Amino acid sequence: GSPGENLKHIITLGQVIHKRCEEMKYCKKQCRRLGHRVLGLIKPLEMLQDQGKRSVPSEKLTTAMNRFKAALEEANGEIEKFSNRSNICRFLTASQDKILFKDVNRKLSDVWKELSLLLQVEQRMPVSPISQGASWAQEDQQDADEDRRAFQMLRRD
């Protein structure tokens, strides 16, 4: 029977962060770079949500997905707290990291592989060389460089 709606959360969890930042008029705008990655992870997840045959996502499979949603839940969670101009700064003050999703970047990866096993065994996909790789956290530093200026520009009208 499977849960059904539960699976949907797996995908929505990703888009949620993409749309969440889209509205936020703060540094979150840069998150678009990190979101673009996760957005591609849910791509294949949607195909399963609606296939050309009565699917049967056992619990064993749902387990992995459940771990993925956890990664996205955090990404959006931290952002929600940065909704306040005073909060976003208050955190950064004790964050000691220009990047907001520095650790989250890895989390989404550690949890992603969890599904890669089911996607490679079922979907028969590589799920690794395409998205995953070696340069991930470093890429953030690139965009972060601009984020710093975003705080300065605030001064001028």
Ligand SMILES: *c1nc2c(c(=O)n(C)c(=O)n2C)n1COCCOC
């Ligand atoms: C508060 N404090 C911040 C920031 C920020 O964006 N960056 C890059 C920082 O380094 N620090 C210390 N914010 C959020 O920006 C304030 C928005 O006001 C317009």
